[PDB]
Design a protein around this ligand. Structure first.
Ligand SMILES: CCCCCCCCCCCCCCCC
Ligand SMILES: CCCCCCCCCCCCCCCC
Ligand SMILES: CCCCCCCCCCCCCCCC
Ligand SMILES: *[C@@H]1O[C@H](CO)[C@@H](O)[C@H](O)[C@H]1NC(C)=O
Lengths: 97, 58, 221, 103
């Protein structure tokens, strides 16, 4: 992943809204934590989420370098997420950008 | 045929009522964290009619 | 004042009210019940259309009830034709407010039934079906008695005997060992014994989610 | 009283159930004695219904007798219990539509 690409600024927009309740949420929480494992130490990441209001799953509020540690905060905050409420792509992309 | 059609249409209305009520009670409530083996859910109307028919034939 | 309302039913609008019933059936078909309060645009529009349908039903309620009276209008198939609006009016009286409220929506599924009220060639066949149903209540009583007797016998015999399951003996994980657990019975009892590396010990697994066992009396029925 | 028994049963609950069982089998045995008084056994065993009730009564009383042992402390055949429910079938005969249809 170092030779194959240049440093990134990832920003995962998990969709924790009502319609992902159930199995779709178990795959989102798994797949997010399976994507934070493709981040080096010289590329940043944050994990937002939106259910008619876009917030952060973690306590970071900006990009956080994806160290061995910063990832653990994000992985452990993604795993403790729950589906609820309507889905709003406008307010959740206006938070990512 | 005027009476076969009437009987079948009344049956169809019974199935429609017990499928609208099916969506009202069990709409989207079948999401269990187990693998999605619930093919016969009540989610939308065509998938509710198949489930009500499957119950009907038992 | 009552004369115009009375001559309204002379005009064949009953077709338009039946078309309102059909439009209500179609408005209910398109409504997708998303799992946890989620919704799309279509479900948002259908609520405004639903306020429209409550309006067009309450109006005809006034018209048909003033021209036939409080003691004669309900004295027909029309009872639910009012009942259905009454509670659904309450739905508005609660929907703007916000609980147990969303489930109250279920009443609106009885509106298709009002359709068989409109056309008589279906009312006659429905009455035929119900009239044929009436003689079977003796069979229904016999089946009720059979269920009662056999549930009581099951209670006498199968009284909570379906819980000891085949857990793993090594003891680290107390999840039942088998992929599809089946109620076992430890030694000194009959039935099935576990394999070479497990223990048939109590718990709660037995049957599926404890829904189909014989413990209680409402489980036995 | 045959219907309330439920897995997860209180120790006092079983005792109350047994007291009620003794009371009810006693009333049915009193029925039996009174009916035998009303007409001698030569006039009793004509009706199959009374024979059926006699079997139910004797099974219940023998079960009460065998309850003397304590296989499970308040902390062995079960067959004669099943007579107690079976008496309910007699109640079914009250209706005449049911009686004629099944007959
Ligand atoms: C008799 C014809 C009935 C057809 C449907 C009537 C109600 C439809 C209203 C909403 C339609 C869905 C689109 C919502 C706007 C994007
Ligand atoms: C006419 C009687 C209706 C049934 C209600 C009485 C039975 C309720 C039993 C509850 C007590 C269980 C004790 C063990 C815990
Ligand atoms: C445990 C099985 C319960 C079902 C019993 C079947 C019918 C029992 C009653 C039969 C007698 C009917 C009337 C007799 C009149 C002489
Ligand atoms: C998980 O999220 C909920 C959301 O309110 C919070 O109350 C809880 O403390 C969180 N638990 C952990 C272990 O992060």
């Amino acid at each position: 992943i170092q030779g194959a690409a240049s440093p990134k600024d990832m920003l995962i927009l998990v969709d924790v809204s009502g319609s992902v309740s159930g199995l779709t949420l178990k795959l989102i929480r798994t797949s997010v934590s399976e994507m934070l494992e493709t981040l080096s130490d010289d590329d940043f990441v944050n994990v937002a989420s939106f259910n008619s209001n876009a917030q952060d799953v973690s306590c970071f509020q900006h990009l956080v370098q994806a160290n061995v540690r910063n990832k653990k905060v994000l992985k452990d905050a993604v795993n403790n997420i729950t589906a609820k409420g309507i889905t709003d792509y406008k307010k959740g992309f206006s938070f990512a950008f | 045929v005027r009476s076969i059609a009437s009987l079948l249409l009344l049956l169809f209305l019974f199935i429609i009522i017990f499928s609208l009520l099916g969506m009202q009670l069990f709409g989207g409530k079948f999401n269990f964290d187990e693998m999605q083996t619930r093919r016969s859910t009540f989610d939308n109307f065509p998938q509710s009619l198949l489930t009500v028919f499957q119950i009907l034939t038992g | 004042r009552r004369a115009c309302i009375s001559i309204v039913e002379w005009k064949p609008f009953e077709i338009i009210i039946l078309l309102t019933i059909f439009a209500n059936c179609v408005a209910l078909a398109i409504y997708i019940p998303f799992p946890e309060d989620d919704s799309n645009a279509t479900n948002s529009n259908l609520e405004r259309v639903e306020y429209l349908f409550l309006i067009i039903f309450t109006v005809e309620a006034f018209l048909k009830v003033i021209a036939y009276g409080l003691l004669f209008h309900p004295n027909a198939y029309l009872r639910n034709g009012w009942n259905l609006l009454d509670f659904i009016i309450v739905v508005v009286g609660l929907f703007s407010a916000i609980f147990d409220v969303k489930a109250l929506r279920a009443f609106r599924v009885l509106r298709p039934l009002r359709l068989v009220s409109g056309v008589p060639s279906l009312q006659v066949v429905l009455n035929s079906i119900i009239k044929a149903m009436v003689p079977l209540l003796h069979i229904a009583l016999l089946v009720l008695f059979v269920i009662i007797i056999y549930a009581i016998i099951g209670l006498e015999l199968f009284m909570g005997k379906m819980h000891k399951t085949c857990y793993n003996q090594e003891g680290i994980a107390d999840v039942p060992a088998e992929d599809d657990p089946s109620p076992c019975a430890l030694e000194t009892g009959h039935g099935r014994q576990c394999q070479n590396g497990t223990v048939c010990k109590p718990g709660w697994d037995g049957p599926k989610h404890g829904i189909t066992n014989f413990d209680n009396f409402a489980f036995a029925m | 009283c045959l219907a309330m028994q439920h897995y997860g049963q209180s120790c006092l609950f079983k005792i109350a159930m047994n007291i009620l069982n003794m009371l009810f089998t006693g009333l049915f045995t009193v029925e039996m004695i009174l009916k035998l008084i009303a007409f001698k056994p030569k006039g009793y065993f004509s009706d199959p219904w009374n024979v059926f009730d006699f079997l139910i009564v004797i099974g219940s009383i023998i079960d009460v007798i065998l309850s003397e042992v304590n296989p499970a402390e308040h902390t062995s055949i079960t067959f004669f219990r099943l007579f107690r429910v079976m008496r309910l079938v007699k109640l079914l005969s009250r209706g005449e539509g049911i009686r004629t249809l099944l007959w």
